[PDB]
Amino acid sequence: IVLEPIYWNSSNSKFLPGQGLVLYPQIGDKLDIICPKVDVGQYEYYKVYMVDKDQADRCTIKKENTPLLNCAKPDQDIKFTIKFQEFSPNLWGLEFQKNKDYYIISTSNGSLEGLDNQEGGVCQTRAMKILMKVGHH
Amino acid sequence: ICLQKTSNQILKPKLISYTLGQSGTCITDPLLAMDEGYFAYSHLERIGSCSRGVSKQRIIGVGEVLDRGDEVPSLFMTNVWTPPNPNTVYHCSAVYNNEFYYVLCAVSTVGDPILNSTYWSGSLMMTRLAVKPKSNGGGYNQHQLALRSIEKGRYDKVMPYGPSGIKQGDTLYFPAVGFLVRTEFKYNDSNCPITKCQYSKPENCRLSMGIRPNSHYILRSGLLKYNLSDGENPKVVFIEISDQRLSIGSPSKIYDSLGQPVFYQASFSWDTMIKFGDVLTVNPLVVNWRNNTVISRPGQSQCPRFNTCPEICWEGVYNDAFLIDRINWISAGVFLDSNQTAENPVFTVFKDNEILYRAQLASEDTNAQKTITNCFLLKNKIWCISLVEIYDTGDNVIRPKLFAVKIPEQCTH
Ligand SMILES: *[C@@H]1O[C@H](CO)[C@@H](O)[C@H](O)[C@H]1NC(C)=O
Ligand SMILES: *[C@@H]1O[C@H](CO)[C@@H](O)[C@H](O)[C@H]1NC(C)=O
Ligand SMILES: *[C@@H]1O[C@H](CO)[C@@H](O)[C@H](O)[C@H]1NC(C)=O
Ligand SMILES: *[C@@H]1O[C@H](CO)[C@@H](O)[C@H](O)[C@H]1NC(C)=O
């Protein structure tokens, strides 16, 4: 199934203040995460990362991490598409398996000047985090 | 062969018996090489996930490509070797010469050398396997070397990096990569092609020559030369790719087609259109890259399919292409018809600016990843065999499939 796309922007009510955005994707499903271009409010800048549970809990990213989204193009929708499977164009050995939890956060603050902030940010202040409880329910 | 563009279903792919399970395993890190009616093959069998499952067994095998009985080619394994330790062999690459295959691999105790380059010893091994083994043939059938002498110039370490290479007389050339300390890398940022790319910065090309922008090393594709006339322990000599349309060192391939070598380099960064072309010179290595505007591969967000603007990224899939007509520059390969997912393998015959005809190998939602295509003659007809990493959702064992595809002579349905 193609899951409903997730809009990575601070207006999204699906980022619940306590727990962030929780979903239960199944193996074989697909999901887009999109940083919308500026059109109501001004552009929100983010680096978005897949991280481990501790990093999600602590709202921290490590130098070793590579973004899954680099939202820094105000006039362009930027999309990341995931299929929940073993293969991908990812070169780091990252994949998806049933009964495992995966975490996506940003410690950016939304401003251009805070794009590369490594701690806190919207992960902390707005619960802009995604928990993917793959193959669960 | 059919030289016309057509939507007729003229390609008729055949699933052929695999060269060679248990539930919950993945057969991964494949190699297939073909030369002179023979092939070489390797894989890693893992228990669990394709990326991080426990390493169970590494196979390195050779055999013959033969008519299976109905004028369709298939692979018949004749000689298999299993390294003692499945955890320590990486990045094998194969070259055929004079009734043997030579398989060059990295030996590592620190994991994949690409991901832990600073700690990798630089150790290499060469395995020689007879394509027609003998009864009690000992060292004729299977013979091992550690490569002691390695000439790498400015590069800190060098490694095989791609499935297969070529022989010229008794000199082997394996696709390879050099690890160069990044502070030693010479690059003029003014050369980064950003004139049509409003968000690109001059630095993007240089920063993207390593697996991260601040990586200790940059990666430079090239060849490892091994001259068998040297004797029983030849040196190996690295030979860098030229800097024309430079992209991060990535799995590559040099192959003979119709009398000349051709080089293919996987697009593992921002230059996502197919990188391949006739080899102008082997040493120094210069490749007359095609200006191909139609073949690409899936990436992720920064460097997805069809991207041409310099970006800082390291992502993509190896999906090679095999020249089948030099005069008209027509080639064949299996490409993944998706922007950012490893899905939907399609066997495709194409020119620089035009796809001629194609065949979906499975479904639109079938998972597929690395593809390795080699073409040859069987009883006067052009055939291609493509290894395709492939599976469908729900399969309890993941393992590549082999597809044989005859190139049609006429364009009529
Ligand atoms: C994202 O959220 C802000 C409010 O928090 C809103 O003003 C802005 O318009 C949103 N961006 C878009 C383009 O939807
Ligand atoms: C390989 O070695 C032989 C014997 O010395 C030499 O004649 C030949 O030129 C070498 N071939 C190369 C370097 O391609
Ligand atoms: C591609 O174009 C460049 C000129 O822009 C040229 O140097 C090169 O030879 C072309 N490649 C081929 C195979 O024609
Ligand atoms: C794939 O990417 C291209 C090029 O950016 C785009 O035009 C197309 O809409 C994308 N979506 C697909 C193939 O579904």
Q: What is the dihedral of CA A1, B396, B162, B207, to 10 degrees?
A: 40
User: What are the tokens at B248?
Assistant: 């991060």
How far does B280 lie from chain A, in Å, by closest CA?
31
Decide: B168 in ligand 4 pocket, CB within 6 A: no
Give the span between the Cα atoms of A29 and B319, in whole angstroms: 24
Give dist(CA B287, CA B278) in Å, integer.
Answer: 6
The rounded distance, in Å, linking the Cα atoms of B4 and B367 is 30
The C-alpha angle B250, B252, B253, rounded to 5 degrees, equals 175
For B409, what's the count of Cα atoms within 13 Å in the CB-facing half-sphere?
3
Q: Are strands B150-151 and B236-240 parallel, antiparallel or unpaired?
A: parallel
Residue B281's Cβ-count burial label (10 Å; 0-12, 13-18, 19+) is exposed
Residues A117, A132: Cα–Cα separation, whole Å: 24
Dihedral sign of CA atoms B275, B276, B280, B282 in order: positive
Identify the residue among B54, B269, B300, B302 best suited for mutation to test binding to A, counting A beta carbons within 10 A and taking the highest. B300
Ligand nearest to the CA of B167: 2
Tell me how far apart the 2 most distant CA atoms of chain B are, in Å.
66
Cα–Cα distance for residue pair B26/B22, rounded to 1 Å: 9
Residues B384/B407, Cβ–Cβ less than 8 Å: yes
Q: Which of B106, B63, B108 is nearest to B81 (CA)?
A: B63
Atom 3, ligand 2: residue with shortest CA distance? B229
Q: Is the CB of B306 under 6 A from ligand 4?
A: yes
Contacts (Cβ under 8 Å, ≥6 apart) of B378: B65, B67, B71, B72, B73
Burial class from Cβ neighbours inside 10 Å (0-12, 13-18, 19+) for residue B393 reads middle
Instruction: Determine the residue type at B3.
Output: L
Beta carbons of B299 and A80 less than 8 Å apart: no
Among candidate residues B300, B304, B298, B361, the one with its CA nearest the CA of residue B332: B361
Ligand nearest to the CA of B304: 4
Please provide the distance, in angstroms rounded to a whole number, between the alpha carbons at the two ends of chain A.
Answer: 16
Answer whether B113's CB lies under 8 Å from B159's CB: yes
For B21-40, the DSSP string reads --TTEEEEEEEEEEETTEEE
Q: How far apart are CA B58 and CA B85, in angstroms?
A: 8
Structure tokens at B403: 């597809």
Residue with tokens 């094998």: B92
Neighbours of A54 (CB within 10 A): 9
Each domain of chain A, given as residue ranges in start order, spans 1-137
Whether residue B116 lies within 8 A of chain A, CB to CB, comes out as no
φ and ψ at residue B204, rounded to 5 degrees: -65, -40
Verify whether ligand 4 is closer than 6 Å to residue B308 (CB atom). Answer: no
* Burial of B259 from C-beta contacts in 10 A (0-12 / 13-18 / 19+): exposed
Nearest to B299 among A73, A78, A89 (CB): A89
A97 φ/ψ sector (left φ>0, alpha ψ -120 to 50, else beta) = beta
Give me the half-sphere count of Cα atoms (radius 13 Å) on the Cβ side of residue B377.
8
C-beta atoms of B297 and A93 within 8 A: no
Q: Which ligand 3 atom sits closest to the C-alpha of B288?
A: 13
Atom of ligand 1 nearest to the CA of A40: 9
Q: Which residues of A touch B393 (CB under 8 A)?
A: 27-28, 85
Residue B131 to residue B135: CA distance in whole angstroms: 13
CA B228 – CA B7 distance, rounded (Å): 48
For residue B398, the chain A residues in CB contact (below 8 A) are 86
Amino acid A92 reads: W
CA distances from B389 to A39, B31, B400 (A): 42, 11, 4
What is the experimental resolution, given in Å to one decimal place?
1.8
Ligand 1 centroid to Cα of residue B303, in Å, is 26
In this structure, how many other beta carbons lie within 10 angstroms of the beta carbon of residue B267? Answer: 27
Question: Could B342 and A89 be called an inter-chain contact, meaning their C-beta atoms sit closer than 8 Å?
Answer: yes
The set of long-range contacts for B189-192, using a CB threshold of 8 Å and a minimum separation of 24, is B192/B310
Indicate if ligand 4 lies below 6 Å from the C-beta of B339: yes
What phi and psi values does residue B329 have, to the nearest 5 degrees?
Answer: 45, 60
**Beta carbons of A81 and B340 less than 8 Å apart:** yes
Question: How many angstroms separate the CA atoms of B248 and B156, rounded?
Answer: 16
Residues of B in contact with A69 (CB under 8 A): 301
> What is the pairing mode between strands B25-35 and B397-398?
parallel
Of B143, B198, B366, B211, the residue nearest A76 (C-alpha): B198
Which residue has 């921002």 as its token pair? B270
Q: Kindly state the tokens that stand for B188.
A: 């003029």
With 0-12 CB in 10 A as exposed, 13-18 as middle and 19+ as buried, what is A104? buried
- From the list B363, B366, B382, the residue with the least C-alpha distance to B374 is B382
Residue B379 burial (10 A CB sphere; 0-12, 13-18, 19+): exposed
Q: Which residues pair with B227 in a beta bridge?
A: B171
B229 CB within 6 A, ligand 2: yes
Cβ neighbors of B187 (< 8 A, separation 6 or more) are B205, B206, B209
For residue B44, report the phi and psi dihedrals to the nearest 5 degrees.
-115, 125
Token pair, residue A122, equals: 């919207």
Q: Which of A50, A75, A91, A95 to mutate to test the interface with B (most CBs of B within 10 A)?
A: A91
Task: Give nearest CA residue, ligand 1 atom 8.
Answer: A41
Q: In the sheet that A30-35 helps form, which strands lie side by side, from edge to edge? A: A6-7, A30-35, A78-83
Among candidate residues B36, B42, B31, B43, the one with its CA nearest the CA of residue B64? B36
Please answer whether residues B274 and B321 qualify as being in contact, where contact means their C-beta atoms are separated by less than 8 angstroms: yes
DSSP letter for each residue of B289-323: E---SS------SSS-TT--S--S------B-EEE
**Which residues of A lie closer than 8 Å to B, measured between beta carbons?**
27-28, 30, 63-64, 66-70, 72-73, 76, 78-83, 85-95, 97
Peptide bond into B304 cis (omega under 30): no
CATH number of the domain that B334 lies in? 2.120.10.10
CB contact (8 A) between residue A88 and residue B341: yes
Tell me how many degrees the CA angle B177-B181-B182 measures, rounded to the nearest 5.
100
> Residue A112 contacts by C-beta under 8 Å, 6 or more apart in sequence?
A45, A72
Q: Specify the amino acid at residue B212.
A: R
Quick one: which of B361, B359, B351, B349 has its CA closest to B389? B361
Give Cα A118 distance to the centre of its chain: 15
Domain count, chain B: 1
Reported as type and span, the H/E element at residue B334 is strand B330-336
In whole angstroms, give the CA distance from residue B145 to residue B129: 12
> For B311, phi and psi rounded to 5 degrees?
-145, 160
CA-to-CA distance for B318 and B93, rounded, in angstroms?
14
Q: What letter represents residue B77's amino acid?
A: M
Domain that holds residue B327: 1-413
CA of A70 to the centre of ligand 1 (A): 17
Q: The tokens 């502070």 sit on which residue?
A: B183
Q: Answer whether B371 touches A (CB < 8 Å).
A: no
Angle made by CA atoms A33, A37, A43, in degrees to the nearest 5:
105
Helix (H) or strand (E) holding A50: strand A46-51
Site of tokens 């027609």: B132
Phi/psi of residue B301, nearest 5 degrees: -70, -45
Evaluate whether B56 touches B43 at the Cβ level (below 8 Å). no
**What are residue A113's DSSP bridge partners?**
none
Tell me which residue has tokens 């349309």.
Answer: B245
Q: Which two tokens stand for residue B204?
A: 């993007």
Q: Which residues of A64-92 are buried (b: 16+ CB within 10 A; e: fewer)?
A: ebbbbbbbbeeeeebbbbbbbbbbbbbbe
Closest CA to B40 of B148, B216, B164: B164
CB B223 within 8 A of CB B157: no
Method of determination is: X-ray
Three-class secondary structure of residue B190 per DSSP: helix
Question: Checking DSSP bridges between strand A46-51 and strand A100-105, what pairing results, if any?
Answer: antiparallel
The number of beta carbons lying within 10 Å of the beta carbon of residue B123 is: 18
HSE-up of residue B339 (Cα within 13 Å, Cβ side): 13
Between CA A72 and CA A91 the distance in angstroms is 23
Q: B51–A88: do the CB atoms touch at under 8 Å? A: no
For ligand 4, say whether the CB of B364 is within 6 Å of any of its atoms: no
Q: In terms of CATH architecture, what is A1-137?
A: Sandwich (2.60)
CB atoms within 10 A of CB A34: 18
Which tokens go with B105?
């691999």
Residue pair B217/B182 in contact (Cβ under 8 Å)? The answer is yes
